[PDB]
Amino acid sequence: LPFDKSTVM
Amino acid sequence: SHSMRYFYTAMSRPGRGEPRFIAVGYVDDTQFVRFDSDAASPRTEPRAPWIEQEGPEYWDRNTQIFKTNTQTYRESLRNLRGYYNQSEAGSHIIQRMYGCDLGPDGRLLRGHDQSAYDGKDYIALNEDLSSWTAADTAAQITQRKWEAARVAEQLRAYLEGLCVEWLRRYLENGKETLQRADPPKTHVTHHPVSDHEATLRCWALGFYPAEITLTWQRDGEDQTQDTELVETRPAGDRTFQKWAAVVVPSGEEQRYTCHVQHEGLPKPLTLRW
Amino acid sequence: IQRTPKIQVYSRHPAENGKSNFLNCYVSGFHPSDIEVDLLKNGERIEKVEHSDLSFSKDWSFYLLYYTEFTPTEKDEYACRVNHVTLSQPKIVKWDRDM
Amino acid sequence: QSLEQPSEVTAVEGAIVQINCTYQTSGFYGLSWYQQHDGGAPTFLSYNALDGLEETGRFSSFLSRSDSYGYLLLQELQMKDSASYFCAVDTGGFKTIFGAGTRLFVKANIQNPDPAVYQLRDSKSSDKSVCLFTDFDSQTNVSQSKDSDVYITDKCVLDMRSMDFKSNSAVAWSNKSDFACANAFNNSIIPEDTFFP
Amino acid sequence: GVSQSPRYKVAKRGQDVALRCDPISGHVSLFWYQQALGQGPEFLTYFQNEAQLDKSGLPSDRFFAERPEGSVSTLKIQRTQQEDSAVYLCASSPTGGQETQYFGPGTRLLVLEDLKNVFPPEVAVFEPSEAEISHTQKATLVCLATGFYPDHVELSWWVNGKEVHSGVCTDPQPLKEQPALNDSRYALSSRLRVSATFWQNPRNHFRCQVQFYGLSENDEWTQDRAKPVTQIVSAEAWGRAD
């Protein structure tokens, strides 16, 4: 299962 | 011994549509998930048999994460362009590589996360999994955002827990292909290239995992200068292949010997022909 | 910033004339990911060529495998035409049975 | 995918209070806390991703992932701390699950209690009259009237910042001429209550 | 911070309603929430810039959320029903999900069968007791907001033109004048405590203001009594030396 936090750079 | 890793690729294409996001997941050298945003209705697709047994709750979740990342990386590609004061006309790439490594013990050996911009190291997670290593001034702007968002905290928690947890599940479901190492099929071929010059080719075929060591020994010594080593290549059926070659004087072929090293083999192997 | 692709043209199993196999064109070590790869039988483009999902190595350089189903025969020439932004003109590399 | 927290919690001014929160999910990413005043905007207090304590002035939040338990501790209780406190669980992605909330009641520290019931008049007495119960201790309780035409509000704390003086107050009114201060309260009131005609 | 409009909204059944949200500049993430009495905010829809990434939490397809420009977000509720009555809160995060959320004050929506019960309040001030001044040297001014429907009011005390907060005490929740009724009108009280000398000065002006949220100019009203519109009802008093 992939990382479940999408943060803008 | 075992590892689960995710490889991301975000690509801007000014005028050729919305930026393209590709996500791909691996369990050691075996790929199991894929996602391309370029599809009509983009969905996560299985690339291994042992992952097809996963329910739709898993499949609609992966699709949700990767669909969200597609939007996040459109904004990230736009922002990094502004940091580097780059033209809105150029095509740039953000790549992410994260995952967890497990020792024979089955415990977490090492957690890792690395991000690149146009093939250059940008922002990496330190070995403590608490601080960031920003490659330049622009990467420090990303770091300050990622500090306020608590990325390192929630990423550390995932890499120590969920990453390790899911890797163990994938390893049990695929125990027949993933935990069983296929040894290479070996043979050495003779190809004359002159009157008294000939090429000896040591073949390592149909082996899994990808790590191998092929060496040519002239009566006991290594030939790094002469040994034309070919890069390990995927056979295309989840196995790998590699070859080692040496140009030798005719008659003396028998004094040359090939040593193959793979975990599928109980003890190192010696070939000569 | 831009990197050159390493090309390898080979068969899945050791080639035998008349016996069906798989022709593979492995591209690696290139950057950016935008790459044109075609498999050619006597100069004719093999129309149903499939490819692996875009992944990359430790150094961030991309790699993908282009593959099709082929039956090696005594004299028909097999090759792989590759074009990248790093290349001036397409790089055609002929398939050798011995490598 | 849910979480639990007490309905109400009561503490005195200057004291400390604890609000417990247990979560029941399969993929915890974070446990955050929010303060919300009646008809207001929920404001962030603290977030817990990893196990331990997070301190932000008078607010501190604990977390234990193995026990799926977390709590909020508030120091030096002020009257402005009277609000609803919510614990929120993040399970990856974006969908946040909030609890039913815990209503905290801050009981004012009364130094010199002077319970009394005073009568007030309007500019134009052609409408009604009002009875005010004030300066009573925080332990006192005010209930609803026996009569249907007699209205009573709940007790609230005012603070005269110039004089460092806090006072509890409960208002009562009716439109019938029969209504007066002595009969106005049909509840448990303190004996030393002043009444003046 | 995050702004939201309107603060309160009363609507008739079947009518269309529009709720505006202005999040913090640069906030990529936007959330819409529904809040029921005695409950916490329940997720409705998620936005990352202009892209609506999810809307699973929305009750019906009557609900429509937009953010064409990844800044201002609107929520349109086509053909309103009584079940739609709740506080609609909007929140924002700077760079993505699983972060600190910044909320707006929310829109309190009340959907009704008709609007014949909507009523503005009657505001009345009650001058302090001489006994209170003689016993505690303090003066309490009591304000009474009465006979208003619905629960949509904002009471404030104004002394000599400016708003005051010291000694002020407004009721937490307004009471019902008729508790055994559905159509029950509301009552709200407030106290302002000042010193004896401050009340004894006839130069001091006291004004209890009550902002009521009712009907708009577009809302239909075919009744003999005046249209209960969004208005300010006030009662005043001047200082008494006595």
mmCIF file of C-alpha atoms in Angstrom, chain D residues 14 41 45-46 55 57 67-68 83 91 95 99 105 110 123-125 130 134 149 157 162 169 172 178 180 190:
data_model
loop_
_atom_site.group_PDB
_atom_site.id
_atom_site.type_symbol
_atom_site.label_atom_id
_atom_site.label_comp_id
_atom_site.label_asym_id
_atom_site.label_seq_id
_atom_site.Cartn_x
_atom_site.Cartn_y
_atom_site.Cartn_z
ATOM 1 C CA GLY D 14 -7.395 28.104 37.534
ATOM 2 C CA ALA D 41 -15.137 28.552 13.724
ATOM 3 C CA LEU D 45 -5.042 23.346 19.185
ATOM 4 C CA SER D 46 -2.530 20.467 18.663
ATOM 5 C CA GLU D 55 2.729 21.325 24.070
ATOM 6 C CA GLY D 57 1.121 27.044 25.916
ATOM 7 C CA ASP D 67 -3.615 1.674 22.922
ATOM 8 C CA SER D 68 -5.397 3.829 20.218
ATOM 9 C CA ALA D 83 -16.342 25.778 24.518
ATOM 10 C CA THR D 91 -6.589 7.760 8.430
ATOM 11 C CA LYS D 95 -11.347 12.464 4.949
ATOM 12 C CA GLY D 99 -15.949 13.157 17.436
ATOM 13 C CA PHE D 105 -17.937 24.260 31.669
ATOM 14 C CA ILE D 110 -16.016 33.823 43.371
ATOM 15 C CA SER D 123 -37.730 53.403 29.967
ATOM 16 C CA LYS D 124 -41.423 52.782 29.046
ATOM 17 C CA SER D 125 -42.907 50.391 31.698
ATOM 18 C CA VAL D 130 -37.303 42.156 35.184
ATOM 19 C CA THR D 134 -26.640 38.009 40.866
ATOM 20 C CA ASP D 149 -45.810 33.064 31.764
ATOM 21 C CA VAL D 157 -20.319 34.756 34.092
ATOM 22 C CA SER D 162 -11.110 47.000 35.484
ATOM 23 C CA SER D 169 -26.076 36.222 36.805
ATOM 24 C CA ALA D 172 -36.220 36.377 35.199
ATOM 25 C CA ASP D 178 -48.925 39.555 39.796
ATOM 26 C CA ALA D 180 -42.540 40.117 41.833
ATOM 27 C CA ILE D 190 -28.807 30.605 49.105
#
